[PDB]
Structures are given as structure tokens and as C-alpha cells.
Amino acid sequence: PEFLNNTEPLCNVSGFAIVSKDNGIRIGSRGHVFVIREPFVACGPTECRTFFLTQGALLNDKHSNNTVKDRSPYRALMSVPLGSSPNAYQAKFESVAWSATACHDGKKWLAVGISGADDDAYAVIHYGGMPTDVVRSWRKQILRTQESSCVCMNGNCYWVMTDGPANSQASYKIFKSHEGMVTNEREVSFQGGHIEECSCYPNLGKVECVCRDNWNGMNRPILIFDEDLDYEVGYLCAGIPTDTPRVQDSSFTGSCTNAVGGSGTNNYGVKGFGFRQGNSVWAGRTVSISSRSGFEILLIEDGWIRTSKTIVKKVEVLNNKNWSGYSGAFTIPITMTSKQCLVPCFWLEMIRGKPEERTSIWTSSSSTVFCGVSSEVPGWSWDDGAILPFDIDK
Amino acid sequence: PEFLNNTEPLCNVSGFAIVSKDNGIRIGSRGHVFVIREPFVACGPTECRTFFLTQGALLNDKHSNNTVKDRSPYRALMSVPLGSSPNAYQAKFESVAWSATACHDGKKWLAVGISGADDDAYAVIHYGGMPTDVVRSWRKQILRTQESSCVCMNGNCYWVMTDGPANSQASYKIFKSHEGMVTNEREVSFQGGHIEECSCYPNLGKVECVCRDNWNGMNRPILIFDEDLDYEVGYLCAGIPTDTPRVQDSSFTGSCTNAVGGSGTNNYGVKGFGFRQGNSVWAGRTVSISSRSGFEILLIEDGWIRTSKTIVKKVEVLNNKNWSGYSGAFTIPITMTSKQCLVPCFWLEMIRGKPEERTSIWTSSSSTVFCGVSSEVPGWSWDDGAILPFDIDK
Amino acid sequence: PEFLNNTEPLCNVSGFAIVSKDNGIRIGSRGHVFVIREPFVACGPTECRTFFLTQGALLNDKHSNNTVKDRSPYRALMSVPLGSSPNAYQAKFESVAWSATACHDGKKWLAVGISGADDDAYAVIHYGGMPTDVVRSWRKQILRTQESSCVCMNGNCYWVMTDGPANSQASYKIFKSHEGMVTNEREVSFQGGHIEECSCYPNLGKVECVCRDNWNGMNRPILIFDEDLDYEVGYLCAGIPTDTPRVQDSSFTGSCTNAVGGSGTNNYGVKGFGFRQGNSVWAGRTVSISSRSGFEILLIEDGWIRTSKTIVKKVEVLNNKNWSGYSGAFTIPITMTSKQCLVPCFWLEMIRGKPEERTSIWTSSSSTVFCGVSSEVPGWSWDDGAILPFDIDK
Amino acid sequence: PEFLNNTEPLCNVSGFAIVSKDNGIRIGSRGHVFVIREPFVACGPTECRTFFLTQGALLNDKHSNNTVKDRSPYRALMSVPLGSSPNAYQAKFESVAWSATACHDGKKWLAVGISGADDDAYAVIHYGGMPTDVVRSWRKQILRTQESSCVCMNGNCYWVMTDGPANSQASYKIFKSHEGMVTNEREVSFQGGHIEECSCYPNLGKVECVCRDNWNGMNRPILIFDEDLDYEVGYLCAGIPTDTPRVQDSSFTGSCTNAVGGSGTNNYGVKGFGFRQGNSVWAGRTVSISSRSGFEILLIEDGWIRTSKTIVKKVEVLNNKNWSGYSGAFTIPITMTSKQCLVPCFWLEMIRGKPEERTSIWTSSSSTVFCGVSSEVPGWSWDDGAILPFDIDK
Ligand SMILES: *[C@@H]1O[C@H](CO)[C@@H](O[C@@H]2O[C@H](CO)[C@@H](O[C@@H]3O[C@H](CO)[C@@H](O)[C@H](O)[C@@H]3O)[C@H](O)[C@H]2NC(C)=O)[C@H](O)[C@H]1NC(C)=O
Ligand SMILES: *[C@@H]1O[C@H](CO)[C@@H](O[C@@H]2O[C@H](CO)[C@@H](O[C@@H]3O[C@H](CO)[C@@H](O)[C@H](O)[C@@H]3O)[C@H](O)[C@H]2NC(C)=O)[C@H](O)[C@H]1NC(C)=O
Ligand SMILES: *[C@@H]1O[C@H](CO)[C@@H](O[C@@H]2O[C@H](CO)[C@@H](O[C@@H]3O[C@H](CO)[C@@H](O)[C@H](O)[C@@H]3O)[C@H](O)[C@H]2NC(C)=O)[C@H](O)[C@H]1NC(C)=O
Ligand SMILES: *[C@@H]1O[C@H](CO)[C@@H](O[C@@H]2O[C@H](CO)[C@@H](O[C@@H]3O[C@H](CO)[C@@H](O)[C@H](O)[C@@H]3O)[C@H](O)[C@H]2NC(C)=O)[C@H](O)[C@H]1NC(C)=O
Ligand SMILES: *[C@@H]1O[C@H](CO)[C@@H](O[C@@H]2O[C@H](CO)[C@@H](O)[C@H](O)[C@H]2NC(C)=O)[C@H](O)[C@H]1NC(C)=O
Ligand SMILES: *[C@@H]1O[C@H](CO)[C@@H](O[C@@H]2O[C@H](CO)[C@@H](O)[C@H](O)[C@H]2NC(C)=O)[C@H](O)[C@H]1NC(C)=O
Ligand SMILES: *[C@@H]1O[C@H](CO)[C@@H](O[C@@H]2O[C@H](CO)[C@@H](O)[C@H](O)[C@H]2NC(C)=O)[C@H](O)[C@H]1NC(C)=O
Ligand SMILES: *[C@@H]1O[C@H](CO)[C@@H](O[C@@H]2O[C@H](CO)[C@@H](O)[C@H](O)[C@H]2NC(C)=O)[C@H](O)[C@H]1NC(C)=O
Ligand SMILES: [Ca+2]
Ligand SMILES: [Ca+2]
Ligand SMILES: [Ca+2]
Ligand SMILES: [Ca+2]
Secondary structure, three states: OOOOOOOOOEOOOOEEEEEEEOOHHHHOOOOOEEEEEOOOEEEOOOOEEEEEEEEEEEOOOHHHOOOOOOOOOOOEEEEEEOOOOOEOOOOEEEEEOOEEEEEEOOOOEEEEEEEOOOOOOEEEEEEOOEEEEEEEOOOOOOOEOOOOEOEEEOOEEEEEEEEOOOOOOOEEEEEEEEOOEEEEEEEEOOOOOOOEEEEEEEEOOEEEEEEEOOOOOOOOEEEEEOOOOOEEEEEOOOOOOOOOOOOOHHHOOOOOOOOOOOOOOOOOOOOOOEEEEOOEEEEEEOOOOOOOEEEEEEEEOOOOOOOOOOEEEEEEEEEEEEEOOOEEEEEEOOOOOOOOOEEEEEEEEEEEEOOOOOOOOOEEEEEEEEEEEOOOOOOOOOOOOOOOOOHHHO | OOOOOOOOOEOOOOEEEEEEEOOHHHHOOOOOEEEEEOOOEEEOOOOEEEEEEEEEEEOOOHHHOOOOOOOOOOOEEEEEEOOOOOEOOOOEEEEEOOEEEEEEOOOOEEEEEEEOOOOOOEEEEEEOOEEEEEEEOOOOOOOEOOOOEOEEEOOEEEEEEEEOOOOOOOEEEEEEEEOOEEEEEEEEOOOOOOOEEEEEEEEOOEEEEEEEOOOOOOOOEEEEEOOOOOEEEEEOOOOOOOOOOOOOHHHOOOOOOOOOOOOOOOOOOOOOOEEEEOOEEEEEEOOOOOOOEEEEEEEEOOOOOOOOOOEEEEEEEEEEEEEOOOEEEEEEOOOOOOOOOEEEEEEEEEEEEOOOOOOOOOEEEEEEEEEEEOOOOOOOOOOOOOOOOOHHHO | OOOOOOOOOEOOOOEEEEEEEOOHHHHOOOOOEEEEEOOOEEEOOOOEEEEEEEEEEEOOOHHHOOOOOOOOOOOEEEEEEOOOOOEOOOOEEEEEOOEEEEEEOOOOEEEEEEEOOOOOOEEEEEEOOEEEEEEEOOOOOOOEOOOOEOEEEOOEEEEEEEEOOOOOOOEEEEEEEEOOEEEEEEEEOOOOOOOEEEEEEEEOOEEEEEEEOOOOOOOOEEEEEOOOOOEEEEEOOOOOOOOOOOOOHHHOOOOOOOOOOOOOOOOOOOOOOEEEEOOEEEEEEOOOOOOOEEEEEEEEOOOOOOOOOOEEEEEEEEEEEEEOOOEEEEEEOOOOOOOOOEEEEEEEEEEEEOOOOOOOOOEEEEEEEEEEEOOOOOOOOOOOOOOOOOHHHO | OOOOOOOOOEOOOOEEEEEEEOOHHHHOOOOOEEEEEOOOEEEOOOOEEEEEEEEEEEOOOHHHOOOOOOOOOOOEEEEEEOOOOOEOOOOEEEEEOOEEEEEEOOOOEEEEEEEOOOOOOEEEEEEOOEEEEEEEOOOOOOOEOOOOEOEEEOOEEEEEEEEOOOOOOOEEEEEEEEOOEEEEEEEEOOOOOOOEEEEEEEEOOEEEEEEEOOOOOOOOEEEEEOOOOOEEEEEOOOOOOOOOOOOOHHHOOOOOOOOOOOOOOOOOOOOOOEEEEOOEEEEEEOOOOOOOEEEEEEEEOOOOOOOOOOEEEEEEEEEEEEEOOOEEEEEEOOOOOOOOOEEEEEEEEEEEEOOOOOOOOOEEEEEEEEEEEOOOOOOOOOOOOOOOOOHHHO
16 A cells, blocks of 8 residues: 555546435435534545444434524534435444545545534544644634544645634634644635635645635635645635625626625625636636525636636536535546546535425435536536435424 | 457357346335446456446435436446446445446456546556547547447457447447557448447457447347457348347348347347357347347357357247346456356346336346356246335336 | 464363254244255354255245255355344355265355256355355266364365265265365265265364264265275264164274164164364264254264274263254364364254154254363253144144 | 564553444344444454344344353353444354453464353463363363453463352452464462453563453552563552442552552442553543443543642543443554554443333443544543334334
């Protein structure tokens, strides 16, 4: 076993093909399936896995009642093989966690899970299934992290954390680790900017992140850093906003440097992703400008470097009649593909139950997962598919 | 790990012995078992697996209600070890798919799954669990494939696809792949012929396929091709028809070149199989000429090369009082047997529920699987065995 | 991987220690557990497994209703790790079978499963999970076999089969196989004797079997054979009868050569076992002389060579207030123990439901398993423990 | 594969970080999860597992009714990966057992399980899944052992057993084994002392144990021994009592040599643990002095060598409003960490149902697990979380 280099360029792709769909909520109507959030994906050399957070409650059971806060002592990070339902008997325990990130360095799985009180939380780092290190809250205000795959290159793994207010200036840090030990960290200076729930991927030996601004921006922050934790921080240049909530494209003017907001979009957002394509960018977004419904991905010409409004490709993978949710980025290593570049992939969360479906007492989600390919690929609408309400709701 | 040669001659066999029976529907009366179709089998060097399509709904659950079209966004290809029930906790996710084929090249599993809209479907090729390539619909009319094992020889894997009308001239293509990448393709010219749901196997380094004509033929198309995708196409010569629906043997005259139909048999069929035995052929068929009930296999003397009506052996594996369904071919590699030839095997699908059993709201199937042996083997009737209706039907 | 020699002498043991108890029926009150019979055990170099026959029906499900004959098309042989419940999600499919034997040769698992009609049954031999050979019924009268572990030595595996009447002279054969291919067979001449359900084990390079006489004997047949299938056949010499039904010890006179019966004991029996200990013998039996209740094992001084009534040790592992059933022999290879001899072990089946418990609609069994050790070990009563009737019975 | 040295010094740690939480009872509201006690943890070179005792009954099933004594013929030791629920389909059978210990020597798992009658119990030693040896009761009075991990060093594994009265002078023995064979034993002379349920760990090539006195001591016995089974025995010196029941700290005077009790604390206790830290000690205890509620761990300055009352650190991991239970020690080997010392960890059992919650008919527990780290870590309260009563209780 060797460490994965993962220093290759990201592939240029012309479309995204569906790779998996877990159908977890449909299955959980009768099967024993966890109520979950954030079904993020991470890949090792020979295996991709779906990670997820759960309260340790099953679908159609009384413990799924939404009577416990998100950041509870029951919240755990688990994983299953990509495409599997998040069920009670295939699930692998990863970490205690109400916020998490995970990735694979070529030799072992790394899992970072945050638990504890809001004013004194801490991350426990798990490497090869063993607890190896901890990161304490430095602002004592809900230490939190990506809710998607971290990035490993040359045996070092990297991730982004936030500590501080949800709707005003907070503190943002980048971490470097080796075999589960934190070996370096750096605070990112970003006055007037806000970073949450970063979706990060490797690209030519640097980590590129597209994040969520939960303060003044309906455009997404971009954070790029290297092995020294030297960084560049700003906003996705594109004159097309990709957070939710946002305004219609024609009412938006882009910025590479500043959060662009207002018009009722401040103080919220959703986790999302983007992939640099030379000077251009593939960016995901909900179809609705106001709600977490539908999902589409746009190729914006020169969108990484200027305030372009030129959309050269657009693919819809979930229509606006269906609930979406978080989305995140990951990559497939060279060690399984016949390529000399890293394949960009994303997962899409489709939330069912509360808050949008109030006749249910619970909230869960299922996923679809897509990977970039060298040719154009048609879209469709791969919705969750569960028929609500469920037995427990009656 | 090395690629499987698979260039040996197909074994001559004198009988078929039962290898497995999954009892999936019986088990699913209480256990957590998917509602499925097409439980096809494919074998690697050391392992055979049952693949299947599911809507992501379990037996005895409301989601099994037949209220969704076959080609849905929920449809997925999964697999379990041969003989296992298609259950929620042993199942391995293979591909999003409402049509599929899968096989093993000696090193890794290949899975080809088609999804998307009828007018713009696409196959996603999965190799070693990673998405590697795509094949787009070229006629924009329900791109579709074998619903049984593909064939790998010398590290190349091959399969047959169809695109176009169900009941008139369509378009048929053969594909060649290496490590999940399409490396060659060829359109098969077959004017007046119709090819669906090919059952293919390796024989002396060529791929031999016995298919379904859903147009003018109650005889089965035969397609034989080599590594260059050079091909021969026609019909099973035998003066014994083996599709369903068909007419009684005495009312049928065979043809090597032309579809033979009429007499109320046009515009339908069922997936089935045959195995060349030198100049002769083993061919499966339902016992009933009109319905998918019962199953028997016939050895027809010189049936591969002339319009013979000489049946030298016949074995029944399911009596006509019981529902059958699709059947398909596969082979067992040399790397597990003590033979210098490839062992011919078939699977039999036994459909329960709709359309034949209208007091049930669902449709599923279970399987029996048989392999050829060097001596004669008695038949019997190994039926599905589930007691309908089920709880959910009341 | 290499073939297991298994030519060592059987260990002399002074007691039997409990190794496992599956609690399958207790678990199956709520869990998804097969209704089973004959939970026999077989061991490879690094692993012991419990094999079992099932109708493919689960406990507490309607399909467990005793409305199907034992020799049905649904009957299958499966296995789980030793000590595991025979459940729907850990079970490994082995063979279609209403009668079976299985063992491990050091490299792969061998499973022999009989199915088909009573007048034309056949065994399918599975090796490493692949069908390799068949054995046809030669008397056309319920071909049947051990219902316990077969024996492998030096890469050859051996088992005993019977074909013919249940309660009069039948035909008995020994089989030799290599890598799943039958390489030799021999009919055992035993006029006036009856052999069923042999419990066999290796001892100094020969196979020693203790069987069931279902005709005129309340004493157990002994069959000993070598690699050439040369054999000795007779009855356990001991003046202590060990079949059920039988008479009280004081009413019995032993014989090395002849079936001893009468007194209402003819035409029935139960599968059981014994282990040669030099000139002596460990023999199991039900505590009751008439019913399958309780279980004890007796060390009979010189019981292998003369009509001894000297019982030097006796251990009870199930009291007479509890239902027993079949019992069988197996051995643990040197490759896991620190011994130069083969450790003798037995499994005990504890039957619940019909016929003894008529308020239940089903019949299943669970197991306890014991291995011989160099010192005396106290007994106890490890009963099945399920509380009947079950939900489905109401 | 090689034997684990495990002769390194125990790490000095400044805090304990949460590693896992199984949420078993919450999951078992709907999933198939055993009713358990003593979810102890043991680690091999590459894997930690949760072991547990069960009656072979599932949560929410009638067999979970508390109508069977603890020491029953149904009681079994099983294991799952650390963090997994003790469920019916992931569980691995380890031993028949109503008392147990288990550990890993670097090559294989060792499991020691005691069963049989109170007046003639015996331990069966399982090594690599094979029965290898037995230990008989020597006082014929409920032979019993640690209910936590044993200790392996240089290929030898060690554990402590007790035989005799629960509330007066009993007999205590230390055992040494190699590959599942008992190779040495020693009776520990401890007149006026009482040893039960030892929590043991390796430290610089010796075994250090912190136990439970169920007689005259509210302080915990300490037993330290080496490879020769030479030993030192006494009591934890600290002037802080850590058993339950106990008196308030200010009412307690420590002793290194004598049991300190009275004041209504005699004749009971709870399994607990401590870790030597040079001259100091980390010791766990319930928050309540009288009941098994809450849990905290204290670093007592010089607490290993003198009657110190100086508490330098205290961390609470479960508040006093929540039920606790047994706790035990284990260590993480060097072969997974980047350390030159053995990491001290503990598990905490949280009991639900009887006796404290009398509206339930059953008793089970779930666990949280913590490992020592080089920095201080905040506490919190990670409670079981199940909502009682359950369906079966109505
Ligand atoms: C999920 O949690 C909700 C909120 O706790 C539960 O809803 C509430 O359940 C309680 C208990 O049944 C209800 O209280 C009862 O009302 C009846 C009718 O008058 C009365 O007889 C009882 O004395 C009690 O007051 C309450 O009405 C109900 N709804 C609320 C609070 O909005 C719900 O039961 C939980 N669901 C599950 C599956 O656990
Ligand atoms: C499977 O799908 C079928 C078709 O949707 C379902 O059958 C239909 O179920 C609905 C809802 O219960 C029925 O409608 C109701 O009839 C009652 C009686 O008058 C009326 O009070 C309601 O207002 C409503 O109209 C309908 O009759 C029934 N049958 C049909 C449409 O043929 C079925 O419920 C589904 N099964 C499962 C398990 O989901
Ligand atoms: C297991 O199999 C047995 C035998 O088939 C089943 O018992 C029988 O069940 C049938 C159907 O419920 C009963 O027939 C009915 O009796 C009622 C009462 O008069 C009548 O209204 C119906 O027309 C019908 O005749 C029968 O009495 C009953 N007992 C027998 C045959 O001895 C049983 O239901 C099966 N259990 C399960 C769980 O499947
Ligand atoms: C768990 O075990 C307890 C103790 O055995 C069970 O409680 C007892 O259950 C029995 C049987 O239902 C009860 O006896 C009955 O009382 C009714 C009412 O008068 C009477 O008609 C019957 O003739 C019988 O005497 C008993 O009252 C009840 N409670 C006790 C003994 O304290 C309980 O059923 C078990 N729970 C489960 C889920 O198995
Ligand atoms: C993805 O496309 C980009 C843009 O075309 C490629 O980047 C160019 O690469 C060429 C050759 O090295 C350079 O001359 C250009 O300056 C690059 N342009 C930009 C904007 O960076 C890139 O090579 C492609 N990546 C892959 C893996 O094919
Ligand atoms: C299966 O049987 C066929 C037919 O007998 C065998 O094919 C013959 O092989 C011989 C020897 O090579 C040739 O002389 C004949 O011309 C062949 N006949 C035909 C019709 O092809 C074939 O060898 C057998 N296959 C196996 C694996 O034994
Ligand atoms: C089991 O016990 C038997 C009986 O004592 C042993 O067999 C004897 O072995 C010695 C030494 O080879 C011979 O001299 C005797 O003739 C044997 N007696 C009989 C009746 O066979 C046997 O060695 C023991 N087996 C083991 C593995 O220890
Ligand atoms: C844990 O801390 C103890 C106490 O400080 C360390 O033990 C000391 O080690 C030094 C260096 O060998 C000795 O000079 C002292 O005599 C020791 N003190 C005692 C009380 O034993 C110990 O080294 C530390 N362990 C680890 C693994 O770092
Ligand atoms: Ca925002
Ligand atoms: Ca047709
Ligand atoms: Ca008899
Ligand atoms: Ca005490």
C-alpha cells in the first residue's frame, strides 16, 4: 500500500453521468435504514463510500421524531459503499459527529468528526479506525467543517473548518494532517467574507474549494491553498449566482473579491460546489432561486476568472418539482480510471420530510451521484421517490 | 490478477443440473427483499453473482405498488452472490439502470446500466466500481441491452445493444470494451430482422448470441461475432420454434435466414437462450406456446445448421402449472472447473404477481440456475413457491 | 493454499466442552431467521461453519406452515459461521438440497446436495462454489446422504450415500472425490444391515463412520473405509444401545456383527455419532429410550471391540425435560490447534414445534456444539430456549 | 503476522476524547439488536471490537422479558466492530458465556467464556475461533472473570479470575496463556481483600489491574503482575474513593493496603477502571455516590502511591441525570498510532430498563468509548438516548 499522489490536473469534462442512487428512503419504508443528512462521498484508490450523519434513529421508528436538536450527543458519522442505502446492517461506524469530513490517503481512511457542546466542541481525528488527534474549538462558537470529502495529496490530508457566528464575521482555518496527526494549520484572513461547508477537490497539487457564504453573499466563496497552507481567498467571479437563496441571473452582477447579496438573500445559503475548468467553471445550483428544489449544473465560460454571464452548457439532474438539498464535490483517483487526470464528481442530497413536508414528523435525505465525462450527457430527473407520509407519521 | 482468456471451446453437455435457487419471494414474505426482475447470472474467475433490476422497493411494502413505469429514475442494477436472495443487506449496488448487462474480465467486474429519458437515454459503464465511459442513444428510442451476462475474452468485454422501435425495424450494435472504455463498435445490418435481449456466451474465441425477435419472428435471431466485431446474423435454423408466443412445432417450418411468424405470434416475445453444440443446439423455451409458463430445454440434432425437427433430448425444469419468465445464458470459466472447455449454464426467471396474478399489486421474480454436465440429468419442477396474495395485497 | 493432510490419529479425550450455541429460534422470534433442520458443522483449516437445510421460509412467517413435504423443490443447503443464527442476511447459499453433506479439503469448500423427484433424484457436487459433478440415484428410491460433515484427507473427500427402502434392505455406497469430481465409488455389502445418515470422521488416515439403522437395529452400524474404498462394516460392539428408539441397557445384549432390535424399536432411529478411542468409544444418545429428548455422551470401556457394558464416563449436555434431535460428528484440523491429533467434536440439534409441540404450525431446530478436551468437563443443560407458541401460531 | 510486543509504557494523557457511541438501544427500537450487558472493548493490531454478553434475545421481543437468570444456558459472548450496534446480522459469535474476557495477541483473537452450573462452571478458551483449552472452577462457587479486555504481551495473554463468595473472602487467580493454551497460573493471596471484574492494561511489560471489591471496600483493589505471575496486590492509594456505592470524598480516608468501607457501602460495587500515570492516576467513577448514574474521570496527583486528595483534572462524560453502569479499560497498540507508548482508553456502559426503570420488562445497555490524548479535552454528556418504555413494555 502506498500514498496516493493525487497531484494530477483535474479533468476537463463536457458532461456529468449518473453513477449511483441509493433509494434509501424508499427502502426505509420497510427496511432498517437510518434517518440521515449529508450523504457525502469520498473515494480511496479502489473504493468510493457514502458517508452520512445520523441521530442513530431509523426510518418509521419513533426515535426519528424531530424532537432532538441537530447537534446532539447521539449524532454519528457512518459510511456504506457508494450506492448502498444507509442501513443498519451495512453501515460502518466512523466517528461521533454532528459535523464531519472524511477522505482516503491511499493507505487508510481519515475521518474527522466534531462533537461536544456549542461553546466547547472538538473534532476527533480517526485514522485507519483509530483515534489519533483532536482539534479544539478556538472561538468557542460551534466548531464546524465541510460536510463533504477532504483532500489527500502525497500522504497529507487537508480540510477547512469554521468557528464563530452563523450570520456575521467568523473565523476560518485550514488544516494539514499526516496519518491522522495535525501537522500544520493556518487562519484564513477574509474580512467581510464568510466561509461554511466547503466543497474541496485536488487540482494540479493544490486544493480548490467552493464554499457557502451564510452572511452577505449569494455568490460562493472560493478558497485555494497549497501544501504550505499558503492561500488565495475570494468569490466565484461568475456573473451567475449559485447559492440559495439568490436573485435571478439578470439582477446579479458578479465579483471576484466581494460578497454580493441583499434583496432578501442575506443570512442563509446552502452547501454547494464548483469545478475549475481552466478559466471556466462547472457550478451546481438549485433550480429555484428561493428554495432547495431542483438541481442543475452550469458550465460558465471564463467564470473562474471574470464576471462572465456566458453559460455554454447546462444540465438538469432534478426538476424543480422535487426537493434537493446539499451538494458536494469529490474526485476519482487515477488508480481506477484509465486517465492522467482526476475525475470531478458531485453528490446531490434530496431532503424529505420537515421542514417542507410538515405532515411528517421526521427529516431524512437520499442521494444521487454524478461524475464528469469527456462528452456531453443528457439530463433527466432522478428524484428521491419516497411516498410520504410514512407509517410513523400516522 | 490476470485477464481471463475465455477462448476455449464451449463444453458439449448431455444434461443440465440445478445449481441454485434463491427463494427470494418466499423469504421476502417476512425478510427485507427487493422486488426485482431479470435475475441474470455472471461469473468471474472465482465467483458467480446474481444481478437484478429493482425499483428500490421491498416486498410487502407500499412502494412495491405497480404505480411506476418500468423505466423510472428509481430503477437500479444490484447483485448478490449466486443463490442469495436479492435482499436489502447483502445487495451490492452496481449501476443506475432500467436496462443492463454485466460480466467479469478476470480482474474486475464490468457493469453497463442504462438510464435517462426514452428519447435520450445513455449507458454508464462501471469498471471495478468506477464510472469509466458512456454510450449515448443513437436512435433516441429506448436504448436497451441484454438483461444478461456480457462476454469477456482476453481482457476485452463485448455486449449487444438495440435502439429503435419495439415492433418494427430497429438498429442493433455490438460493442467492444477494455477496462471499461469502449474501444470499438459496429452496427449490425439485419433488414427484416429484430434483435432484443441477447443471451451471449463465448465459444472458441467468438461470441455467440441467441436473441429475441419482437417483430415478425417466433424463431430466435442468432448473432455471432469476433474480436474485430465482424459478424454473422440470421435465425436459429431449427424447425422447432423457441420464442413465446409461438405455434405448435408441427405448424412451424424453420429458416436459417428469415423471421418466421404470423399466426398471432407477431409483436411479442420473451428473452431466452441457446447453446451451440457443434452442429446441434440446446435451446430453452416455455412449455406453453402462448404464455410464460413452464420451462424445458431441448437438444435439437443439427439444429444450428439446418431446419431440423429431430429432438434428441428434452428436460423439463418447471412444469406448465407454474409461471416462468426470462431466461439467459452464461458460462463458468476454466479457473474453477477441472475442464478444458467452458461450461454452459442458464438462469430461469419465475415471475409472480402482475400481470398474471391480478390480486397482487406488485410484480417480482425469483430464479433457478442450471449448468451443463457431461451426463444426462433428470428434470423436476423447481417452482418459485411463494404463497400469494401477500400481506400488502390486503 | 494447500490440501489438509488430515491423516493424524484422532485425539483421546476425557470430556467435551461447549463451543457454541446459536440461539436461532429465540432470535427468530423477532429477527429474520430460517426455519431449519440438521445444523451440522464442518471445519476448514481456519474456519468452522454451521450448515443447515431450509425450505426458504422464515420463523414467524406464513411460509413456515408445515404444508410442504420435506423433499420439496424449495429445500436448500446454506451455511453461516459456527455459532451464528441461521439468518437471512449472514447465510451463504451452498446447494439446492433436501439431503446433504459438506466438508473442506484445505483449499476449498465441498458441498453435496441432493434434489429432484424421489424416483430419480441426483446429487450436485459444488466445489469452491462451482458445480463440478453429479451423482445419480442408482436404485431410484430417495437417494440420500449423511446430513453431516464429509471427510477430506490428502486432497480427497469422501462420503456415504444410501438408495432404497427406509425400513428394509437398501443399497449403500461410499464415494471418493478430488476437487469436486467423483474419482471412485464402491457399494458396501451389508446384507441384513441398514445404513442411514452416517456421522464420519478421519482417524489415522481412515474414515470411521457411526450410522443409523432404520430397519432391525437399535445398535448403530459402524463403517470404516480407506482411500481405496476398501471397507469393514458391522455394528458398534458395545452392550449399550445408542439409537432411539431403544430398550433399557439391562435388556440389551450387544453384537459386533448383527443388528439387534425388536421390542418395539424396529423401523425407526435417529442420526447420531460415536468416536473410537483406541479400543473404547465415546457414544452419544438421547436420554430417553423412546423419544428424542435429552442428550448424553458415554465413554464405554472397550466398546469398539467387544460387547462391553462398562460405562467409565457419562456427561449430560441436555436434560430429559428438553427436546433434542439429530447429532453428528466432525473434527478440528491441526492447522488451528496446538495438537498432533484431530480433535473430535459433535453438534446437537434441538427440535422445536411439530411433531412434539402440536400448538405450533412449524418445525425448526437450534444447535449446541461441543469439542473433546484432554480433561474431564462437567455437564449442564443447554436447551433451545425459545418460548412457544410463536406469533404465527396464533 | 507477528505477535504484538505491547511492552511499551502507557501514554501519559491530559484528557479523554470520545471515539464511539453505538446508539444500540435507540436503533433497537425498530432494528434487530440484542439485549446486552458489558459492551467491553478490545483491540488487535488493526481493529478494535465491542464484545458483549446477550441472552440471545432481541430488543422489543418477548424473549427480552427478564424472566431468566443472568447465568443461563442461553448467555453468549459476541462481538461487532467498535461503534457498531450489537445487532443480529453484524454480530460475530465468540463463546458460550455468562462471564467473559477477550483480547488479541497480534495474530489471533482470544476469547474466554464461562458457562455451566454455579457449583461446577468452566471457562472455554477460544483462539482464532477454535476451542483450545478449559479452566475448571476450583472453589465451585461461580467461577467468573473480568468482563473486559484481557492483556497480551509478547505472544502471551493474561487474565484474572475469581471463584468463591460474592460478599466475603473468595479466591483470586491470574492466568497466562499462549495460543489459547493455559501455560501458567497463580493464586493471589489477598486476605481481607476482594477482587472482582478487573480492568487491566499493559504498562511497561507488566499487567496493571484496577478491580471491584464487593466485600468491605469502597476503594478499588489494585493488582499488578508480570510474565512470571509474580504479583503485588493492594488498594488504590488515593484518598478519593471510586467504587459505587461510596461516601462523599470528605468522609473518606485512603489506604494503599486495606479495604476502606462501612457507612452503608459494604457488599456491593460496580466494575470500574483506572490508569497509572507515573505516580498519579486517572480514575473513573459514577457521579452519584450511591447509584449508577453519571460518569466522570479524575486525575489524582500522586494517587497511585499515596492517600492524596488532590484532584488536578476532572472531566464529566455523562451527567448525573442519566444512567451509567460498568466501565472498563483497554489500550490501543503502537501498530496503528504514531506513538511509542500505549494509548489508554475506556468504555462506559449505560444501562436502560430494570432495575431503575421498572415500567420496562427488559434490561439492556449501550456504550460510549473514550481514548486518552496529549491535551485537555472538554467533557459533555453523551447519554444512551433511548425513549422508554418500548413497544414490548405495553
Ligand atoms: C412526535 O412528537 C410529537 C410531539 O411530542 C408527539 O405529538 C404529541 O404526542 C402527545 C402524546 O400522544 C400528544 O399529547 C396528548 O394528546 C392527547 C389528546 O388529547 C391527550 O389525551 C394526552 O394527554 C396528551 O396530551 C400531543 O397531542 C401530540 N401532538 C403535539 C404535542 O403536537 C408525537 O406523538 C410523536 N410521535 C411519535 C411517533 O413518537
Ligand atoms: C396501490 O395503488 C392503488 C391505486 O392507487 C391503491 O388503490 C386505491 O387506493 C385509494 C386510496 O385508498 C382508494 O381511493 C379511496 O377509496 C375509498 C373508498 O371509497 C375512498 O374513501 C377514498 O376517498 C379514496 O377514493 C382506491 O379505491 C384504491 N383502488 C383503486 C384506485 O383502484 C392502493 O391503495 C395502493 N396500495 C398500497 C399498499 O399502497
Ligand atoms: C397453516 O395451514 C393451515 C392448514 O391449511 C391453516 O389452517 C386453516 O386455515 C384455513 C383458512 O383460514 C381455515 O379455513 C377456514 O375456516 C373458517 C372458519 O370456519 C372459514 O370461514 C373459512 O371458509 C375456511 O374454511 C381452516 O379452518 C384452518 N385450519 C385447518 C385447515 O385445520 C392455517 O391458516 C395456516 N397458517 C398460516 C399462518 O398460514
Ligand atoms: C413478561 O413476563 C411477565 C411475567 O410473567 C408477564 O406478565 C404476566 O403475563 C401473564 C400472561 O398474560 C398475566 O397473567 C394473566 O392475567 C390475566 C388478567 O387477569 C388473566 O386473564 C390470565 O389468566 C393471566 O393470569 C399476568 O397478569 C402478567 N403480569 C404479572 C405476572 O405480573 C408478561 O406478559 C411478559 N411480557 C411479555 C411481552 O412476554
Ligand atoms: C483543461 O483545459 C484547460 C484550458 O484549455 C487547459 O489549460 C491549458 O493548457 C495549455 C497546455 O498546457 C496551456 O497552454 C494553456 O495556457 C492552458 N489554459 C489555461 C486557461 O490554463 C488544460 O490543459 C486542460 N486540462 C486537462 C487535464 O486536459
Ligand atoms: C463438441 O462436439 C462437436 C461435434 O462432435 C465437436 O466438433 C468436432 O470436433 C472434431 C475434432 O476436432 C472435428 O473433427 C469435427 O469436424 C467437429 N465437428 C463439428 C460439427 O464441429 C467438438 O470437438 C466438441 N467440443 C468439445 C469441447 O469436446
Ligand atoms: C489413544 O489411546 C489409545 C489406547 O491407549 C492409544 O493406542 C495405543 O498406542 C500405543 C502406542 O502406540 C500402542 O502400543 C497400543 O497398542 C495402542 N492401543 C490401542 C488399543 O490401539 C493411542 O496412541 C492414543 N492416541 C493418541 C493420539 O494419543
Ligand atoms: C509519564 O510520566 C511519568 C512521570 O513524570 C514519567 O516517569 C518519569 O520518567 C523519567 C524519565 O525516565 C524518570 O526520570 C522519572 O523517575 C519517572 N517518574 C516516575 C514517577 O516514574 C514517564 O516517563 C511518562 N511516560 C511517558 C510514556 O512519557
Ligand atoms: Ca448566502
Ligand atoms: Ca417474437
Ligand atoms: Ca433403529
Ligand atoms: Ca465495594
